[PDB]
Amino acid sequence: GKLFPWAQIRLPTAVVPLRYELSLHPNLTSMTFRGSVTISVQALQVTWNIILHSTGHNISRVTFMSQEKQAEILEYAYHGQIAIVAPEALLAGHNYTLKIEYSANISSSYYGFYGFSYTDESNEKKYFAATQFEPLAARSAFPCFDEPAFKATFIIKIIRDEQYTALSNMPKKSSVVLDDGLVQDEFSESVKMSTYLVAFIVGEMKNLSQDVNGTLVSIYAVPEKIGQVHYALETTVKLLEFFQNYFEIQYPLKKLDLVAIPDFEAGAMENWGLLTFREETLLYDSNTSSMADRKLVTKIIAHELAHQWFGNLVTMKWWNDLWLNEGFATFMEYFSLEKIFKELSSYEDFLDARFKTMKKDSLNSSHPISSSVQSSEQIEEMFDSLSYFKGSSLLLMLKTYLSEDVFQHAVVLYLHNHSYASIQSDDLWDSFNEVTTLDVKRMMKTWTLQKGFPLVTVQKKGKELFIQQERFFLNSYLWHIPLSYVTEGRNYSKYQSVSLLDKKSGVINLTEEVLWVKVNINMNGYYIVHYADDDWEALIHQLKINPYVLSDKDRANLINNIFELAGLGKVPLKRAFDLINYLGNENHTAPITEALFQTDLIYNLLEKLGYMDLASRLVTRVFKLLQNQIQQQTWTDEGTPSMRELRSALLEFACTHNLGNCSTTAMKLFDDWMASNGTQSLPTDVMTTVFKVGAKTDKGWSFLLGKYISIGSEAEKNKILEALASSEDVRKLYWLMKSSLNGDNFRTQKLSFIIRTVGRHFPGHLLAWDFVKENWNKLVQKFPLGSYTIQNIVAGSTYLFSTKTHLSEVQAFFENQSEATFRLRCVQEALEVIQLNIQWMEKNLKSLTWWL
Ligand SMILES: *[C@@H]1O[C@H](CO)[C@@H](O[C@@H]2O[C@H](CO)[C@@H](O[C@@H]3O[C@H](CO[C@H]4O[C@H](CO)[C@@H](O)[C@H](O)[C@@H]4O)[C@@H](O)[C@H](O)[C@@H]3O)[C@H](O)[C@H]2NC(C)=O)[C@H](O)[C@H]1NC(C)=O
Ligand SMILES: *[C@@H]1O[C@H](CO)[C@@H](O[C@@H]2O[C@H](CO)[C@@H](O[C@@H]3O[C@H](CO)[C@@H](O)[C@H](O)[C@@H]3O)[C@H](O)[C@H]2NC(C)=O)[C@H](O)[C@H]1NC(C)=O
Ligand SMILES: COC(=O)[C@H](Cc1c[nH]c2ccccc12)NC(=O)[C@H](CC(C)C)NC(=O)[C@@H](O)[C@H](N)COc1ccc(O)cc1
Ligand SMILES: *[C@@H]1O[C@H](CO)[C@@H](O[C@@H]2O[C@H](CO)[C@@H](O)[C@H](O)[C@H]2NC(C)=O)[C@H](O)[C@H]1NC(C)=O
Ligand SMILES: *[C@@H]1O[C@H](CO)[C@@H](O[C@@H]2O[C@H](CO)[C@@H](O)[C@H](O)[C@H]2NC(C)=O)[C@H](O)[C@H]1NC(C)=O
Ligand SMILES: *[C@@H]1O[C@H](CO)[C@@H](O[C@@H]2O[C@H](CO)[C@@H](O)[C@H](O)[C@H]2NC(C)=O)[C@H](O)[C@H]1NC(C)=O
Ligand SMILES: *[C@@H]1O[C@H](CO)[C@@H](O)[C@H](O)[C@H]1NC(C)=O
Ligand SMILES: *[C@@H]1O[C@H](CO)[C@@H](O)[C@H](O)[C@H]1NC(C)=O
Ligand SMILES: *[C@@H]1O[C@H](CO)[C@@H](O)[C@H](O)[C@H]1NC(C)=O
Ligand SMILES: *[C@@H]1O[C@H](CO)[C@@H](O)[C@H](O)[C@H]1NC(C)=O
Ligand SMILES: [Zn+2]
């Protein structure tokens, strides 16, 4: 009771961790554990108190090791900090060794060292423990310096029962039977790393493996699935051979372990050496899995294997620069997939994700990509689309402005100079300046330190393009925007070129008279282009004549930007429906999915406001544009991957709004699969549509719930859950959320997926927002504040409100909560989403009733 000696969230810099040794004896029978942390520290200045991070620990002994003395420990729970009062002052340059012995519980949630139970194929209950330490949960398990810049080497010693296999970051040195009959395994010392990338797993698993030039790649899973792990190994082996070639640095360890965990809230984690996953994101079966499920296992493996360089070998100094980890990993994920997995058309997801990140970055709720964070909530809210898909778009803009070979050299320089060290945003731009003349550092200062993105307005007047730049915002700093443009002349000849606008306005000369100009080729740039109308009509005439003279990316780029500029008010909504009246000649996915998104959004807003005959007049006119392409659809799994994704988009659009005979066809496919008893093989491209039509009946909804609790595909289960949660019976909708929240028949990791599916359609719109409000603090006690789960639920329960009544309701609810809860950007964003729904409906409702 001597006054905690530190009042700042961030630890002192006086003492640095040098070496860590943590031995743990978890039970999982008792769901408690006992741990011993021995930390080698260096004092860089005179010190009287070691300030450490510790959350949820009963300490029995703290000690120093010429004399072995006991130390006093104090605790300031608010900041999750413990202070160790030194017996004699610590001096600079002097190494010391502290040992803390403590007890704690295994956790209730998916964060920290956590445990769960699963029933086997034999009705056998088997236990499992695992770790999720990013962002700030390693202080739950071992007293540590829980800040990423305090890199160190780690020695894990885990005591286990013989039936379990204990995995960790490093390979096992050896395992000895102790006098208790229990085994204590020990792992080789680690590379210099962050505490959040530490990981240990305890559970009954099996493995399939292959050696790549000294590294044994191992994919684990619980034994009833080990045949379901072949696609992951080969993809891991192939993507491993790709990343060690492009980055020209090798995976430094001898084990690349990928584990499929039954209860995990995120899709995956990059824990060095031990990559954790969700069983749905790593396993795959040719017979029960979509192309979209295969297009996620290859994606998620590429994302976390690129974190082994971008995030583990090179790590950010503070969470303000999380985009240097997650934005590089997203970039390298889609870069890998365009080179060695091209036929999956992974660019369509990357393109679609950028459309959605730009809508959120257009709001005043947005922030600079690298902006200061201090609280735990702010650190948890950095795991957002901006850090992932705006960082991956800054890099895609720089790779396409510079050569693809100059980009590679900045990567090789930056990974070598900063290996096993911390980095900030300006360290990367310096690596671009050494391989280039160009001041990449000032070119990227406005894309990193200002919020939003620019709007390039474009006018063709003779043989010159006039270009001006503005911030894309509705109620000053300029950007060094690399412009690209393609143009066609008197002849079908198409010319591509590039420029850099660093001033408010500019002029480009064209050495020919042109038929039309298209700026931002394939949207390699993070900006929206608005044209003058004589230049917009040129692009709309061409679309109505032969749209295939433009790329798939460029035609989805125009659909997105035209509906986006129709909200800010720069264009009339009639103009965006003018454009998409060309879709009678479109049969490629990306433009169709994007037109279907905008159509479905306007339909989902109008329905809630009671305009049901206006909403159904919109879905049938879009159905009439796409009617030829929908009726040629086969209820099979035939075609290329992108043609398979288009098959499910067109049949889900048709069946969700009861258009055509499609629901009659899906109901027959369901009624045969049900008479089978779940036996008849269904094409994986029509399963969700089939299950959704069957779930609208009490027989099919009840049959489908019996398959949920009995089938072993966690991706066909995710397809049945969408059908169940798309019921029109609000008592069934309500019972699905209440069970996921409590963990009974649906795991709590699907609650956000349920709340999302429920709140999107008319029957459960109010039920979902009410359940979130009423159970708000149960959700905050399972998913940390600012987490992706909490951000996904706030956005998807509120984004379809469009009345001043709902704006004050949502605002007043969050004001009744903590200031930290109110100041979440996901909350401020949700409010702004609502405000823009009100304005869009006053501007474009009397005329949209005219066009329709
Ligand atoms: C942690 O401390 C524990 C002490 O509480 C130690 O745990 C005990 O270890 C024994 C044997 O090592 C286990 O004995 C077996 O457990 C099963 C329970 O599950 C099985 O049966 C049910 C019922 O059908 C079934 O659903 C399951 O699938 C299993 O088949 C017993 O039924 C068996 O007969 C057998 O006794 C204990 O379960 C376990 N706990 C307790 C409370 O007894 C543990 O070794 C310590 N671990 C470490 C790392 O130190
Ligand atoms: C439709 O399919 C489900 C499963 O997909 C069938 O339920 C299964 O019924 C069999 C009956 O032999 C059960 O197998 C045996 O269960 C008994 C009782 O537990 C046990 O003594 C044996 O060890 C053996 O496992 C099986 O457990 C059960 N599975 C489930 C998930 O319920 C159902 O009977 C089928 N119905 C029709 C009409 O085809
Ligand atoms: C299809 O499902 C998903 O789209 C989920 C969404 C999601 C659920 N939960 C999240 C939490 C944070 C961030 C995103 C999520 N995508 C992921 O999970 C991604 C893998 C993708 C990029 C292929 N994962 C990564 O990018 C990893 O590298 C982080 N470092 C994970 O960070 C964590 C921080 C706090 C946590 O509690 C758990 C993880
Ligand atoms: C599961 O993992 C084990 C251990 O990594 C694999 O067995 C090892 O295989 C390597 C490969 O050459 C050998 O160097 C070791 O001597 C083996 N160790 C033991 C204890 O057998 C095993 O092959 C993996 N399972 C499968 C199906 O591949
Ligand atoms: C095969 O193993 C060798 C040996 O590690 C790898 O050679 C490395 O190549 C990278 C390429 O830049 C060098 O930076 C490393 O220094 C090399 N290692 C050594 C020890 O010299 C090679 O990449 C491996 N190939 C595969 C496919 O895994
Ligand atoms: C198709 O029209 C394009 C539009 O310019 C023509 O491109 C020009 O070709 C001449 C050579 O005949 C060059 O001197 C010009 O510089 C080209 N244009 C530009 C903008 O540089 C192309 O010649 C036409 N195709 C033919 C004639 O086959
Ligand atoms: C462990 O669990 C107990 C009871 O479940 C709880 O009261 C306590 O705060 C937890 N933490 C520690 C350090 O024991
Ligand atoms: C601390 O350890 C480092 C690494 O071995 C060594 O260079 C240094 O001399 C040590 N200092 C003391 C006081 O032990
Ligand atoms: C926009 O955000 C700023 C701070 O980023 C805030 O001061 C202001 O109130 C917000 N609203 C408007 C309309 O600018
Ligand atoms: C459903 O409509 C499509 C559209 O032309 C047609 O090809 C198909 O034969 C129809 N099937 C039934 C059962 O009416
Ligand atoms: Zn990541």
Side-chain angles (χ1 to χ4, degrees), residues 1 3-20 22-178 180-240 242-286 288-342 344-380 382-475 477-563 565-644 646-842 844-852:
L3 199 284
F4 208 75
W6 187 254
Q8 289 80 41
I9 298 173
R10 288 196 67 172
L11 298 181
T13 45
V15 175
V16 307
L18 290 177
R19 329 167 220 295
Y20 270 92
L22 172 88
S23 186
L24 292 119
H25 176 260
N27 200 229
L28 322 184
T29 294
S30 301
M31 279 273 127
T32 76
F33 86 99
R34 314 222 40 160
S36 166
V37 67
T38 299
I39 318 102
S40 200
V41 312
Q42 193 166 103
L44 306 171
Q45 62 192 22
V46 183
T47 311
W48 300 86
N49 312 288
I50 299 201
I51 315 293
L52 266 195
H53 275 129
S54 169
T55 278
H57 304 105
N58 194 24
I59 296 100
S60 39
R61 252 181 217 151
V62 201
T63 77
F64 286 82
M65 299 127 66
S66 302
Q67 180 60 353
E68 177 164 335
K69 307 170 102 119
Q70 270 193 131
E72 174 180 15
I73 184 165
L74 318 164
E75 75 154 306
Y76 185 45
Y78 190 44
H79 288 163
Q81 291 174 345
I82 54 160
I84 289 154
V85 186
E88 311 195 329
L90 294 85
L91 259 304
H94 278 213
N95 313 335
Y96 307 92
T97 298
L98 182 89
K99 180 206 52 179
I100 315 162
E101 300 178 356
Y102 63 96
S103 97
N105 323 294
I106 305 316
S107 179
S108 147
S109 34
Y110 313 95
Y111 326 86
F113 193 42
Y114 78 96
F116 59 102
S117 208
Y118 69 91
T119 178
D120 253 356
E121 36 187 11
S122 325
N123 255 33
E124 263 164 30
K125 183 210 244 215
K126 323 301 217 64
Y127 296 70
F128 207 106
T131 81
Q132 172 49 49
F133 286 170
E134 197 176 31
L136 300 158
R139 64 190 67 177
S140 323
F142 47 111
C144 45
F145 297 92
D146 210 20
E147 297 186 9
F150 289 115
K151 288 195 186 190
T153 68
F154 277 88
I155 273 173
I156 321 286
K157 259 167 41 180
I158 320 180
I159 294 194
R160 68 144 161 101
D161 272 299
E162 164 262 334
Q163 296 161 169
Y164 300 95
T165 37
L167 295 175
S168 174
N169 306 76
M170 299 288 312
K172 177 271 310 181
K173 212 200 179 88
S174 196
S175 37
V176 292
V177 194
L178 307 140
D180 267 12
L182 307 161
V183 192
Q184 187 194 57
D185 284 30
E186 182 190 302
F187 311 87
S188 292
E189 201 204 15
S190 97
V191 279
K192 222 191 178 167
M193 71 175 43
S194 296
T195 64
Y196 77 86
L197 281 162
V198 168
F200 32 101
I201 290 178
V202 179
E204 259 157 60
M205 315 166 285
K206 289 282 187 178
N207 65 290
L208 175 69
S209 301
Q210 175 172 326
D211 199 271
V212 189
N213 264 31
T215 306
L216 175 63
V217 186
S218 268
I219 320 295
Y220 279 74
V222 295
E224 76 208 41
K225 324 256 207 164
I226 201 49
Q228 265 183 28
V229 312
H230 286 99
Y231 179 66
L233 181 51
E234 295 144 346
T235 318
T236 311
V237 168
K238 257 171 294 177
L239 284 158
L240 170 63
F242 171 93
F243 285 146
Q244 273 170 153
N245 170 279
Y246 176 84
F247 308 134
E248 300 167 9
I249 295 143
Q250 304 282 123
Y251 182 74
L253 323 180
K254 271 179 170 119
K255 92 161 203 153
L256 208 30
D257 283 1
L258 277 74
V259 178
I261 300 196
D263 218 352
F264 195 69
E265 214 300 323
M269 185 60 198
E270 74 246 47
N271 303 321
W272 217 351
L274 186 67
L275 279 62
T276 43
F277 286 83
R278 272 174 86 159
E279 303 207 277
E280 327 154 3
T281 68
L282 197 66
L283 312 173
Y284 167 78
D285 180 23
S286 74
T288 64
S289 265
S290 291
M291 186 58 60
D293 285 332
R294 188 207 195 97
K295 282 194 52 178
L296 165 65
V297 181
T298 185
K299 264 180 32 189
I300 208 145
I301 289 173
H303 184 104
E304 323 289 349
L305 271 200
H307 270 310
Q308 306 294 280
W309 290 265
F310 288 103
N312 305 11
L313 174 69
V314 181
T315 316
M316 74 273 183
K317 219 179 311 225
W318 190 238
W319 307 99
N320 59 338
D321 290 311
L322 179 72
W323 80 267
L324 289 166
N325 279 189
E326 302 294 342
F328 251 115
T330 298
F331 182 79
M332 292 311 168
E333 150 191 4
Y334 286 109
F335 175 59
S336 39
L337 297 191
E338 81 187 63
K339 302 269 138 260
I340 50 169
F341 298 96
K342 211 202 94 181
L344 291 169
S345 295
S346 299
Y347 68 102
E348 297 167 341
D349 308 357
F350 190 29
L351 182 59
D352 165 68
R354 283 178 276 149
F355 291 153
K356 302 179 170 175
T357 299
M358 297 184 79
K359 195 180 197 185
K360 298 190 260 216
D361 208 13
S362 61
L363 304 161
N364 197 36
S365 323
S366 201
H367 61 129
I369 209 170
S370 207
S371 203
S372 85
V373 307
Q374 73 142 27
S375 78
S376 149
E377 313 89 35
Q378 294 158 348
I379 299 160
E380 305 259 4
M382 291 281 317
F383 292 85
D384 63 353
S385 302
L386 271 191
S387 308
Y388 281 76
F389 301 116
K390 183 186 182 182
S392 60
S393 303
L394 299 194
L395 300 180
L396 168 63
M397 215 168 35
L398 214 41
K399 157 177 157 281
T400 38
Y401 179 58
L402 313 178
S403 209
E404 207 182 44
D405 293 336
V406 176
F407 193 82
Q408 191 176 1
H409 280 113
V411 167
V412 193
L413 217 169
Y414 168 88
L415 286 178
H416 268 122
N417 179 9
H418 306 299
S419 270
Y420 303 102
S422 304
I423 51 100
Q424 73 173 58
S425 266
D426 281 2
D427 282 324
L428 172 75
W429 305 143
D430 292 333
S431 293
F432 279 100
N433 283 341
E434 332 166 16
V435 312
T436 66
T437 303
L438 300 212
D439 195 5
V440 184
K441 215 179 181 159
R442 274 303 159 298
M443 180 198 311
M444 298 292 95
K445 183 189 180 183
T446 324
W447 297 98
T448 48
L449 298 182
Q450 195 184 8
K451 66 152 101 203
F453 53 90
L455 168 69
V456 179
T457 37
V458 164
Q459 314 110 20
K460 194 203 72 221
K461 300 176 187 183
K463 316 189 311 233
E464 38 203 338
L465 275 170
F466 298 82
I467 47 141
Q468 308 76 36
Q469 60 168 299
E470 232 173 7
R471 182 154 72 96
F472 191 76
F473 87 105
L474 169 149
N475 202 309
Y477 284 105
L478 294 190
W479 290 267
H480 294 7
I481 321 165
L483 289 182
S484 67
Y485 60 90
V486 62
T487 187
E488 185 178 303
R490 341 305 302 111
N491 161 32
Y492 171 71
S493 270
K494 294 191 339 290
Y495 170 64
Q496 283 175 299
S497 175
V498 314
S499 171
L500 188 137
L501 182 58
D502 79 296
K503 276 151 31 191
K504 163 187 151 285
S505 34
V507 172
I508 310 163
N509 193 50
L510 316 150
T511 62
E512 145 83 348
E513 280 261 70
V514 298
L515 273 46
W516 51 263
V517 68
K518 166 73 182 52
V519 185
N520 201 1
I521 298 153
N522 296 341
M523 201 168 78
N524 299 124
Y526 196 64
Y527 55 102
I528 298 195
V529 179
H530 170 45
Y531 309 77
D533 189 72
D534 287 15
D535 303 321
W536 259 119
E537 78 191 15
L539 284 164
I540 289 177
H541 180 86
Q542 186 60 68
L543 284 180
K544 304 205 178 177
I545 298 311
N546 185 9
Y548 297 122
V549 305
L550 288 160
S551 75
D552 258 8
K553 320 185 71 170
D554 273 342
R555 284 189 324 260
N557 184 28
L558 292 170
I559 303 180
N560 171 256
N561 290 15
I562 198 60
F563 279 90
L565 308 150
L568 188 98
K570 308 300 278 184
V571 200
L573 205 82
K574 153 195 52 68
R575 215 85 208 118
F577 282 119
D578 276 322
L579 191 144
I580 70 158
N581 266 1
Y582 97 98
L583 285 167
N585 298 325
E586 183 60 78
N587 35 36
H588 289 316
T589 311
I592 294 203
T593 40
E594 180 60 20
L596 284 176
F597 170 76
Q598 313 291 350
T599 291
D600 296 337
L601 177 60
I602 296 172
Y603 174 96
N604 279 343
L605 285 168
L606 293 173
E607 175 188 52
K608 311 305 181 294
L609 286 158
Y611 310 104
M612 270 77 170
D613 158 77
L614 203 157
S616 166
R617 277 169 198 260
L618 181 64
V619 281
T620 74
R621 170 159 319 188
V622 177
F623 171 86
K624 286 181 195 342
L625 294 168
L626 311 173
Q627 187 186 160
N628 288 343
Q629 304 91 295
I630 297 166
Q631 295 170 341
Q632 319 171 153
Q633 292 312 305
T634 305
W635 297 70
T636 56
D637 281 345
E638 308 168 356
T640 70
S642 156
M643 287 177 167
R644 299 182 59 183
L646 184 49
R647 166 183 294 112
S648 318
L650 292 176
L651 298 180
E652 202 92 280
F653 172 79
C655 285
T656 300
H657 310 93
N658 312 106
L659 294 167
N661 61 19
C662 301
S663 281
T664 296
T665 299
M667 182 94 266
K668 172 178 185 49
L669 297 161
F670 182 95
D671 287 343
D672 288 335
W673 173 83
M674 190 175 36
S676 79
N677 200 18
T679 279
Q680 200 128 308
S681 149
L682 277 174
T684 59
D685 281 354
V686 308
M687 226 178 329
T688 325
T689 294
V690 161
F691 293 166
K692 272 181 161 194
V693 153
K696 302 295 205 301
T697 69
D698 281 19
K699 306 289 153 132
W701 195 100
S702 301
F703 177 82
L704 274 167
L705 176 60
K707 300 291 165 213
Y708 187 87
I709 69 181
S710 75
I711 70 180
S713 189
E714 258 294 356
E716 175 179 355
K717 276 171 60 178
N718 254 328
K719 290 185 192 89
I720 294 160
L721 181 53
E722 195 178 320
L724 300 173
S726 273
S727 201
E728 311 264 310
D729 190 349
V730 293
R731 322 192 172 250
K732 293 179 180 163
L733 295 180
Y734 169 77
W735 167 84
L736 292 171
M737 296 172 312
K738 204 175 172 133
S739 306
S740 201
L741 189 49
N742 300 134
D744 302 302
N745 282 278
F746 306 91
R747 296 213 141 103
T748 323
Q749 68 199 4
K750 294 169 129 168
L751 175 58
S752 45
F753 177 53
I754 300 172
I755 297 186
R756 217 167 39 225
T757 302
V758 167
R760 184 162 42 244
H761 306 309
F762 187 86
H765 188 212
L766 295 174
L767 180 61
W769 175 231
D770 192 74
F771 177 99
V772 169
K773 285 189 305 173
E774 291 305 341
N775 296 311
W776 174 254
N777 294 301
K778 282 166 179 282
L779 304 159
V780 173
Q781 287 159 358
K782 280 169 207 59
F783 319 97
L785 217 64
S787 211
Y788 176 73
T789 324
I790 294 307
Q791 303 176 36
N792 181 280
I793 279 159
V794 163
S797 67
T798 68
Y799 83 114
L800 294 186
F801 292 127
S802 317
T803 83
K804 178 156 201 58
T805 293
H806 280 293
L807 183 59
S808 322
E809 191 226 357
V810 178
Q811 164 151 355
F813 176 78
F814 287 115
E815 290 167 333
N816 283 344
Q817 327 292 323
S818 166
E819 185 78 13
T821 305
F822 188 65
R823 298 309 167 178
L824 286 195
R825 290 182 286 101
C826 71
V827 163
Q828 299 295 114
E829 159 186 316
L831 293 189
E832 209 164 334
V833 167
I834 286 180
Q835 303 193 16
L836 289 182
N837 292 339
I838 295 160
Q839 284 151 350
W840 188 100
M841 291 283 177
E842 297 166 352
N844 313 117
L845 199 146
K846 283 274 290 194
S847 34
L848 181 48
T849 318
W850 191 77
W851 312 317
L852 279 168

